[PDB]
Every structure is written in structure tokens, then in C-alpha cells.
Amino acid sequence: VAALVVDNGSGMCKAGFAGDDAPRAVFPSIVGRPRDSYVGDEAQSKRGILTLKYPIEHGIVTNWDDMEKIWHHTFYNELRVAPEEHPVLLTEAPLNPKANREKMTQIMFETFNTPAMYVAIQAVLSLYASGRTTGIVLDSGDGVSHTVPIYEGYALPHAILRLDLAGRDLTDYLMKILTERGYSFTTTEEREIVRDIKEKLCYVALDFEQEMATAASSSSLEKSYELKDGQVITIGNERFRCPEALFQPSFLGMEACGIHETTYNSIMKCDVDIRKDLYANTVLSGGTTMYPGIADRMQKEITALAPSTMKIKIIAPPERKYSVWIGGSILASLSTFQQMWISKQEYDESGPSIVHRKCF
Ligand SMILES: Nc1ncnc2c1ncn2[C@@H]1O[C@H](COP(=O)(O)OP(=O)(O)OP(=O)(O)O)[C@@H](O)[C@H]1O
Numbered sequence: 001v002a003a004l005v006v007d008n009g010s011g012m013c014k015a016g017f018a019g020d021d022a023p024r025a026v027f028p029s030i031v032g033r034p035r036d037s038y039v040g041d042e043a044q045s046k047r048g049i050l051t052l053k054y055p056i057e058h059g060i061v062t063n064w065d066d067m068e069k070i071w072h073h074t075f076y077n078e079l080r081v082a083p084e085e086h087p088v089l090l091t092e093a094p095l096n097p098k099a100n101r102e103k104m105t106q107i108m109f110e111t112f113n114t115p116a117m118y119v120a121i122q123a124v125l126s127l128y129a130s131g132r133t134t135g136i137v138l139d140s141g142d143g144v145s146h147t148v149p150i151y152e153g154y155a156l157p158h159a160i161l162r163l164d165l166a167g168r169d170l171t172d173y174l175m176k177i178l179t180e181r182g183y184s185f186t187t188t189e190e191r192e193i194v195r196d197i198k199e200k201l202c203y204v205a206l207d208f209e210q211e212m213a214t215a216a217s218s219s220s221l222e223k224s225y226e227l228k229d230g231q232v233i234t235i236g237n238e239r240f241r242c243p244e245a246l247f248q249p250s251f252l253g254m255e256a257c258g259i260h261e262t263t264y265n266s267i268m269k270c271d272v273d274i275r276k277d278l279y280a281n282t283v284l285s286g287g288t289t290m291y292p293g294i295a296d297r298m299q300k301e302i303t304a305l306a307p308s309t310m311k312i313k314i315i316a317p318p319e320r321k322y323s324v325w326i327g328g329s330i331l332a333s334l335s336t337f338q339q340m341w342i343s344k345q346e347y348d349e350s351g352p353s354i355v356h357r358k359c360f
């Protein structure tokens, strides 16, 4: 009899049990409404008559009635369990407003009746999941990208940087640039493909101009995508121009620093004496860091921004895509964290605003 690990993100919900090694339920973060309640895998397939809402916008929860239902679906239909038997580890976005974790507790203890619960910070977790308690996580999902300096399991609120460049925009950026090539992707079923192509084929060029150079001069970097109907689509320098946006947001007419500088900028915002620790412990997580090349490119780029002498180390746990979860599975499982929850009876005594003093 162990705990529960529910990680909620802008596009996917990752659910399972503390003391496992991998989520058991994984399903998009979508609630479907007929212009009578559909969540999960189910929800996607029905779209044509329904309306789809995503209640997690940019890592933060904006609809609470839809959020409640994703969790109704998670416990009952996906995990087949019932909450008032289990303690729940719930995850939160770096710099989640005070109010939102409060409101989160309410739902759990009140609607769901958890005997115990918790909210931890996603970044923080993935940092654990590799085995460290100091560092800076580049976490970057379907909707939002954070750089998060962590010191002794304590994220540093002054040093966090959020950038809303992430999966969905890359998906959108591949569409845009494949469409400039002639192709067309109207429908959302076609869109589901560009999503696949991005994940199947894209990578991160080491040297962006040389690469663009190479692909104008020959076709050595081309790959074909055979569409489920039979038609094969040639994809070329699109393959690395999509994830290039991460390093240069301009591609998307954004005036933002790329994930590299953003990470430099976050390291730089900290007390000087910790930086070398962070520099050398920089963890990728989120599924938008899955592109091959990323590590090196990031190694190359921070090294051009960092002290000439300095030692860098980008860590890319092969697993990273579902690391946030995992990281908490570890935690909720740890016999030494067993007596750190907020309990049903503890809530009753203090209301939601206790979720702060006990969740630092
Ligand atoms: N192998 C891959 N290569 C590149 N991108 C990928 C890969 N696998 C998944 N992605 C992208 O990762 C995204 C999902 O990542 P993650 O699971 O961190 O999302 P999330 O937690 O829903 O997002 P957020 O942190 O933005 O709330 C999707 O945009 C998907 O297209």
C-alpha cells in the first residue's frame, strides 16, 4: 500500500503509483464538450462534434471544473482506483501562484477526500530523478519552458525564467514552414501528423549555418515520411529549423532569448558561489528536449556564454520525457518523506493556506 503520482502538464497527464518507475496512465490534457463528459484518449477521437478545452495553459491551470474532471477520469477510469484510500503527490509549475496550489488542495481534500496530499515543483522533481539536489533544470513541455535553478531541493524564485516556447509552437512552426514548401495541413488530423514528423525526424543542428549550407548543397540530410495512406513526403532542412526556434525565438517573430541564453540568464541571476555547481548540473527534462543534438548544441552554446575556464555539463537522462513523474515516484516512495504530507485531519484544522508552510 503506497502513494500516488499525478503530473499535470499543458498537453499530457502522467499518472501512476509511488514506487513504480514509469507512469501507467498517460493521456492528453483535454476535456471534451458537445458545443456529455469526455477526457483522455477518448476525448481526442470524438472532436468532430465536441469542443476541446485544455485546462492547463502554459503549465498553469486556468479551468478548475475541467481540471477536476481530468482527475476524476484519472483516478476512476485510468487508474481504476479511489482517492480517499490514497495519498496524492500533485505537481506544480515553477512560480504557480500561491492561490492556485491552495485551490488545488481544496479540490483534493474536499471533492476527492484524499487522506493526505502534496504539491511539489515539477522541475525540482526531475532534478531528483537523475539523482541530484543542486542544479538548474531546463524543463520544456508542450506549452511552456522554464529554466529553474535549484539549490538543496529549493528552487530559487528570483532566478526562474519562463518562456512560452515549446512543443505546440514547434508543431505550429513545422506546419508553417512545411506549408511554405508547398504542402498543406488544414485539418487537425493532418496536424497530428506534423506532430509525429517533428518527433520522428527533427533534430538539433550543431552548427546552424553549416547545416543550412549542407542542405542547400546536397540532399544528404533528407528523410521521407510515409503517410499512413501511402504518399511519401520529403522533408529537408525543415528537420532542424523547427527545433532551431528554441535557440532563436525570432523564427517565431518572438523577441525572446533562446533556451541557451535563458539558462545562462538564470544561472547568472544567482549567488555567484553556486553557479559552477549549476553550470555543471544542468538537466534537460520535458519532452521538448527529446530532439537529438540538443545536448551538444546546449554544450556548445553555454560554453560560448560561460567563463572561458568553466566546466559545463548538460545532463540528458535518456528517460527525461517522463522524468518529472518518476522524480516524485521516488519521493512519495521515500520512507523518509512518509511523514511529510498534509493529512485530511491536518487540513480540517488549518484550511488550504497550510499547503505553504508544509510544501516549501
Ligand atoms: N521525441 C520527441 N522529440 C521532440 N519533441 C517531443 C518528443 N516527444 C514529445 N515531444 C513534445 O513534447 C511535448 C510534451 O512534453 P511534456 O510531456 O513535457 O508536455 P507537458 O508537460 O504537457 O507540457 P508543459 O510542461 O508545457 O505543460 C509535446 O509538445 C510533444 O510534441
Ligand SMILES: [Ca+2]
Binding pocket: 008, 009, 010, 122, 140, 141, 142, 286
Ligand atoms: Ca510538463
